[PDB]
Structure 1
């Protein structure tokens, strides 16, 4: 079989995942299909994880039902997986304690510059020691975290695999009465949506007790540095949760109410795509055009506000680290204290460390735990039932449809004004600090130094809001513009384009792709741009001090550019395996629950369990590879992110004779913030490039085949049509079914027809309506058919379709979408349709629209509706093709004023002493005056 190198692996290779390099060399130029992914360990099999849990659950239910109590399943889970988390808590504690020690030893290097003496070498070795203690913490947070992460991630798949085994073992025991309650849907949902929530709980289970401790420690450390002023920064940090919950509650409403306007549009588009052969023939396009335009306009108007709310939230997240500092330090200065550089950046780091993680990870954990407990309760109640006895081109085409390039220039110039202020706000504080120390009581005026600080605080927020708003608007206008082109292009396509593409594909397109364009793209773009600009500022601040740091930057910048590729070229193949191995288990389960009686007939159910386990092991292998490959890259990245910090610190120390304390503090406080932002920036690009495929495939339309125009230059002013040796063909080079369509049907001669099945009887109607322009010409009452627009031709003809169709609407719009008749004229139209009793029995009697795809009626009255359409139209030429009968027969024989009927039917006896009759050959005709000659 396939041995996996996870075992047979020394230490120092599991920290860096050195056992995973060969695979890449193989996936670099071969596209591994299925036989190159290793098998799982012997302690991660379903048959091994689903037995101990079953035993513990049996023991627990026994101990519970023994007494007058209620049994629980959340106790049997902790009886098995308690040592694992007990051991992981040691490391999560060791890790949460290293983020509080960095700022303590950061403030000890700056104090060496505040108290500096060249002729002193005993006070410098202590500085080197302090700096050496500051690197082990980075190496702990950067290298030893990923093994722990992989383990805490693997701790969830075990539970997810243990639950499904017992769920299936139970489902194979349901009785007749018990299975009549729950059907296939719920049983497959228990595995497709519920168990899939245990993978994220273990990641967000340690914050519940690690957030408060961190906050308390941080505030206690702050008290010893500045004093009571610290409170002024912890108040602004708690108001954010109340101020952000309400706006989310408000946003959900907007979303819910726009979903309604979306669904109706989708339904209208669906019912429009099915029946094009009738709309294109009756000339009823503008109605649906307007019906879609109105709904799209409403949807956009409702989406703008939600997008604006999201942009405001992002801006708030961008500039919340400035208000806290501003408030706390203006208070600290007004109370009467003096400002130094060893107290400022320490507090900056403490804040930046606590606020983000706590306010962004404490709320999510609660939702995760709640959902997990709900799913556990569902599973518990279920387990108790009874039992038996791309490219730059796409980006350029997606951006230039939003606004003129001057707007893009303004946007580029507006995004590089927020970061400048973000950095200048701290440079000003370092400048103040350095100006304080050069005094001898020669006090500093606070008006100037405080007003400039306030102004630099205000500009940041203003620009950060403006940027987000403009970006969102520009990226929504692009979808607004593309959807139109899409619709007004697919509406003018031939019928052949629809005979090769099923409705499902086009509907899925119109729904999913536009949803992605309108919902997610702008937010991801904005977050990616923001996090990208947040890194260039760090690097530029680190270069403007110690200019020599530009030399070791060009190599670390070239390595990454390659590494990423060397990774993706095998990472774009694991998702395919995951999906292809996850679908068959669900298929097998769904098809296995129905054929159950035979499985019970023969006492053989041990094989199906083994087959299920074998099906699940493949997905287990794929998940293992996914986790390992995701962790193989972060270590390589963090190595560089930490080498940068080491270089900065030791270079600052080696050059302690040409720079001051404020500058080194500013450079160091930013270098301790690069890892997470770089990770997020590299993570967002994946999603961006993944969802840009929707944009790539949407633009595939907007340029397709296009039939002749609807209106030519020269307008037109008994239907005597004359034919010739013309020939007709569906495709330009397909087979041929009609040859030399030669015949003449002059003034109101009631033509007939007689034909067989498949010998080309339903083709001339497609040529008369020029659904596919054939070779040759056909004269009609002094004018041709190709020298006239499509609408000027398809409007002067009436057809009785074989399959009746009624659209969602009233009996007034479905029979007269264009307002040109009066009400009494419609009543007279429906006077001779033999159907006027049903209408009046309803409230409006003509305006009570119907639903359920017209299921309220049947073929009979629907064909009556079609005949009513034909009558109300009052045209000269008429083409009837049918394949109640007495009603239609007699009434059409009576009403129509003997105007050039063309009847087509499969029953020859439908003719009763007609005027002129024909037969069908395989493409030609055998006819003369009347059939009595031969017959």
Structure 2
């Protein structure tokens, strides 16, 4: 088979995942397909994860049913998986007591500088010990965390694989009564949407008892340094939850109404893309343009506000750590105390450690657990019922369609000032401290020192708020202007581009690509640039204090660029192995649920269980690699993220003779903040470059074929239907640019007011004479129509004067006044006269409005007879001279067809008609007939000679 090295691998070799290199050495050159991924451990099969839980649940049900109570399932899980989490809790108890010891040994190094005598070696080694205790917590946090994370992630897939097994095992004991009620759709939703929530629960399960413990320890440590003034920093940290939950539940409404706005646009686009051969022939391209532009305008007007909300939320998350420190320290200073450099940065670090975890992790865990319990209750209710007896162009084209480059020069200067203020606000405190220490009572004036601080604090907020809104606007205008180009381009592409491409493709494009452009890109771009600018400030602050930390940074910045590619090469292959191996599970489940009776008839109900186990083991294999390949990278990254700190600290120590406390504390407090942002910065770029493919494929349009224009300048006479004389020549056809000809040398002669009929063999080019008059596909040759050609005149000026009668009518979503006259150019009584002349006046009398009778379901409420009648009404009201009749007889014999034929024969004042048909009897009494052979034509004078 494929023995995996996860076993037979000593310790100190699976902490760095040293056993997973050959896979990368292989995938680097060959694109492993399916047979290069290892198997699973023995204790990860389904037969081993399904039987034990089934036994526990059966024992629970028995014990319960014994005494009068209701049985539960959340007690049969915990009875099996308690030792695992009992052991996993020790670590999270050990790593939460390390984020509290760093700031306590950071405040003891700084204290060496305030009291510094160069000729004293008994107090310099103790500082080295303090700094050494500070390099053992970073290793724990950064290196030993990625194995505990893998294990707590693997502790969920076991549950998710155990549930599905018993679920399926239950789906083969159902009785007829209980089966006919529930639909298979819900049984598959159980497995496709619910169990998939057990992979995130166990991750967010320890933030419920380790969140309320960290805050107490931190607010008890703060009291020993500064005092009561700590409370003034914990009140600006509990208000954010109220002031954000309500705003989010307000935000949801905008999204709801935006969706209910945009659904109609997609519906109308679906209705347009199908039936384009009728619109392009009736010249009705503008109405849809207008009633699409309106909806798009409304959608944009409703999206702007949501975008502003999200931008303000991001800007509030950016600069919340500056409103706490300002208040607490202005209070600590106004009460009567003095300021030093050993308390400030300790408090800074503690605040930064608390606010993040509390306000970002405590809320999500509750939602996760609630969803999990809901899913568990659903599955429980199920299990108890009865049984049986790219490139840079793709960025320019997307950024230069948003605004002039002046805006791209303004937002740069707007982004490169918020960070400057973010750093100067902190530098001011070090300046204050170093000026205080030099005293011996000539105290310090508070006005200056305390006003400059408020100024630096306000500028940050203003410059952090403006940027988000500006970026959002600049990035939404781009989509706003691309969609219009796309739409206006599709209304002119010939029909050739349509019959080869399927509707689903274009519609999925218009929906999903635009959704991505309008919803997700700006947020990711903004977060990425923000988290990328924070790091540069950290580095530039650490360098300016110790210029000798620029020599190793270059060796450390060249390994990242190669490692990223060495990983991404084979990281973009496992996703395919996951998806393609996941789909067969649902496929087999659906296939097996239907064909059930044919299974119970025979005593073979376990073979399918073996097949299901086999089909799930492959997904287990392909999922066991995702976690390991995601963890093989974070360790190497955290190695650097942690070596930086060691370098900084030991440099500060071996250079204690040429600096002071303020700047070293400033450097350390910024270096101890690098373990969270680096991962996010390196992780968002992946999503960005993944979803830019929609941008790429959208610009595939905006540059396509383009037929002749709609209107020239050589206008025709005010009325040029005078004498319909459609003469012909040796013109030919070409559907494809180099395809076969379906018509050869059709030189004929049609006279004014002469009803003509065309007969032939179905498939010999009988339905191709239509594509030359309306010139859908520009043919070769000459076609004179009343002393003038059809090639030196715009399409509209021609298509508008030749009325067609299609074979299969179609109705459009709207009133009964639009389908007959979308452009108001006639009078109501005229429409009434036409309708009553087409034998339909009482049919609309029944309905309420008589001018607002909405019809839907693609004209399903009427019969083909009424549809042909209303089309004849269109033709009548149009009142043209030429008339092109087509027919496809598949209706019934009753008075419908007889009446339409009588009307065609009597109503029209013998105005240049020419008919098509297949039934020989339909074409009778005509003047001249056309027999269409397999590519030529041999007509005769009258039907009296034909037979």
What TM-score, normalized by structure 1, do the two folds share? 0.99
CA contact (8 A) 2:64 2:71 kept: yes
CA contact (8 A) 2:917 2:923 kept: no
Q: Is the 8 A contact 1:401 1:478 kept in 2?
A: yes
Give the Å deviation of 1:719.
1.3
Preserved CA contact (<8 Å) 1:727 1:739:
yes
Question: How many angstroms does 1:289 deviate by?
Answer: 0.1
Deviations 1:277-333 (A, max 9, x none): 000000001000001000000000000000000000000000000000000000000
Deviation at 1:449, TM superposition (A): 0.4
What aligned pairs does 1:62-211 form with structure 2 within 5 A after superposition? 62-211=62-211
Deviates more, 1:907-916 or 1:461-470: 907-916
1:381-530 to 2 correspondences below 5 Å: 381-530=381-530
**What's the counterpart of residue 911 of structure 2?**
899
Describe the SS at the equivalent of 1:853.
coil
Shift of 1:717: 11
User: How far did residue 732 of structure 1 move?
Assistant: 1.1
The aligned residue for residue 930 of structure 1 is 942
2:587 corresponds to which residue?
587
Q: Give the corresponding residue for 1:259.
A: 259
Compare 161-170 and 719-728 and name the one that shifted more.
Answer: 719-728
Q: Deviation at 1:13? A: 1.1
Contact 1:258 1:303 in 2 (8 A): yes
2:760 and 2:766 in contact (8 A); partners too: yes
How far apart in 1 are the matches of 2:532 and 2:785?
Answer: 68
Would you say how many aligned residue pairs link Structure 1 and Structure 2? Answer: 935
Structure 1 residue 846: deviation in Å?
Answer: 2.3
* Distance in 2 (alpha carbons) for counterparts of 1:114 and 1:855: 88
* SS of alignment partner, residue 885 of structure 2: strand
Moved segments of 4+, more than 2 Å: none
* Offset, 1:129: 0.1
- Tell me how far 1:360 sits from its aligned partner: 0.3
Deviation at 1:599, TM superposition (A): 0.5
Q: Distance in 2 between matches of 1:181 and 1:62?
A: 27
**Contact 1:153-1:202 within 8 A present in 2 as well:** yes
Matched residues in 1 for 2:312 and 2:289: separation?
35
Q: Which residue does 1:913 correspond to in 2?
A: 925
Cα deviation 1:737-787 (Å, max 9, x = unaligned): 100121111211100111121111100101111000011111110111000
Are positions 1:874 and 2:886 aligned together?
no
In the TM superposition, residue 181 of structure 1 has moved relative to its aligned partner by 1.4
Contact kept in structure 1, 2:757 and 2:928, CA below 8 Å:
yes
Cross-structure match for 1:282: 282
| CA shift digits 1:689-723 (9 cap, x unpaired) | 11100000000000000000001121199210111
SS of the residue aligned with 2:209? helix
Shift of 1:857: 1.0
Q: Provide the secondary structure at the position in 2 that maps to 1:917.
A: strand
**1:224-253 superposed Cα distances (whole Å, 9 cap, x missing partner):** 000000000000000000000110011000
Relative to structure 2, which stretch is displaced further, 37-46 or 920-929? 920-929
Question: Cα deviation per residue 1:355-396 (whole Å; 9 max; x = unaligned)?
Answer: 001110000000000000000000000001101111111011
- Deviation per CA, 1:554-601, whole angstroms, max 9, x where unpaired? 010000000000000000000010010011111111111000111111
1:900-930 deviations in Å (ceiling 9; x for gaps): 1111011010022211112120011121211
Aligned mates of 1:445, 1:181 — CA distance in 2: 81
Describe the SS at the equivalent of 1:919.
strand
2: CA distance, partners of 1:13 / 1:490 = 59
User: In 2, Cα distance between the equivalents of 1:820 and 1:48?
Assistant: 77
Query: Shift in Å at residue 897 of structure 1?
Result: 1.1
* In structure 1, C-alpha distance between the alignment counterparts of 2:851 and 2:409, rounded to whole Å: 57
After superposition, the C-alpha distances for 1:82-133 in whole angstroms (9 at most, x for unaligned) are: 0000000000100111000000000000000010000101100000000000
Distance 1:719 1:550 in 2: 87
Residue 641 of structure 1: CA displacement?
A: 0.4
Is contact 1:47-1:613 (8 Å) kept? yes
Aligned to 1:734: 739
The answer to whether the 8 A contact 1:840-1:846 is kept is no
Deviation at 1:8, TM superposition (A): 1.2
Which deviates the most, 875-884 or 860-869? 875-884
1:894 Cα deviation from its structure 2 partner: 1.1
Asked whether the equivalents of residues 106 and 346 of structure 2 are also in contact (C-alpha less than 8 Å), the reply is yes
Offset at 1:831?
A: 1.6
CA distance in 1, matches of 2:101, 2:198: 33
CA contact (8 A) 1:345 1:665 kept: yes
Q: Distance in 2 between matches of 1:119 and 1:602?
A: 94
For the 8 Å contact 1:262–1:295, the answer to whether it is kept is yes
The Cα offsets for residues 455-496 of structure 1, whole Å up to 9 and x where unpaired, read as 000000000000000000000000000000000001110000
**Residue 630 of structure 1: how far off its partner (Å):** 0.4
What is the Cα deviation at residue 934 of structure 1? 3.0
Say if 2:28 and 2:569, in contact at 8 Å, map to a contact too.
yes
1:889 pairs with 886, 901, 904, which one? Answer: 901
- C-alpha distance after superposition, 1:662-695 (max 9, x if no partner): 0000000010111210000001111111110000
8 Å contact from structure 1 (residues 719, 900) kept in 2 = yes
The secondary structure found in structure 1 opposite 2:271 is: helix
CA contact (8 A) 1:753 1:904 kept: yes
**Distance between the aligned counterparts of 2:370 and 2:831, measured in 1?**
61
User: How far 1:180 moved relative to its partner?
Assistant: 1.1
Q: Is the 8 A contact 1:208 1:365 kept in 2?
A: yes
Partner Cα distance (2:210, 2:723) in 1: 90
Deviations 1:632-682 (A, max 9, x none): 000000000000000000000000000000000000001011121000000
Structure 1 CA distance for aligned equivalents of residues 599 and 938 of structure 2? 65
Tell me if the contact between 1:471 and 1:522 (Cα under 8 Å) persists in the aligned partners: yes
Tell whether the 8 Å contact from 1:839 to 1:846 is kept in structure 2 after alignment. Answer: no
CA shift for structure 1 position 814 = 1.1
Paired residue secondary structure (1:9): coil
Q: Aligned partners of 1:606, 1:171: CA distance in 2, in Å?
A: 12
The 5-angstrom pairing of residues 265-664 of structure 1 reads 265-664=265-664
Runs of 5+ unmatched residues, structure 1? none
Tell me the alpha carbon deviations over residues 34-70 of structure 1, each in whole angstroms, 9 at most, x when there is no partner: 0000000010001110000000000000001111100
Aligned residues of 1:95 and 1:141 also touching (Cα < 8 A):
yes
The CA distance in 2 between the partners of 1:411 and 1:648, in whole Å, is 33
Contact 1:26 1:32 in 2 (8 A): yes
CA displacement, residues 823-859 of structure 1 (integer Å, 9 cap, x when unaligned): 1111111121111111011111121211222211121
Determine if contact 2:110/2:665 at 8 Å carries over to the other structure.
Answer: yes
Q: Partner of 2:10: helix, strand, or coil?
A: coil
Query: Does the CA contact (< 8 Å) of 1:777 and 1:784 recur in 2?
Result: yes
Alignment check: 8 A CA contact 1:574 1:622 kept? yes
Q: Distance in 1 between matches of 2:900 and 2:418?
A: 76
SS across alignment from 2:929: coil
Q: Any idea what the Cα deviations from partners look like across 1:869-912, whole Å, max 9, x if unmatched? A: 11111111111111191011001111111011111011010022
- Give TM-score scaled by structure 2 length: 0.98
Per mean C-alpha deviation after superposition, the further-off stretch among 849-858 and 525-534 is: 849-858
Q: What is the root-mean-square deviation of aligned Cα atoms in Å?
A: 0.9
Contact 2:926 2:943 in 1 (8 A): no
Which range moves more in the overlay, 90-99 or 915-924? 915-924
Contact conserved, 1:718 with 1:899, CA < 8 A, in 2?
no
| Residue aligned with 2:914, SS | strand
Asked if 1:772 corresponds to 2:784, the answer is no
The more displaced of 190-199 and 910-919 is 910-919
Distance 1:795 1:294 in 2: 26
1:717 to 698, 722, 726: 722
Quick check: 1:918–1:931 contact (8 Å CA) kept in 2? no
Contact 2:2/2:39, CA 8 A, preserved across alignment: yes
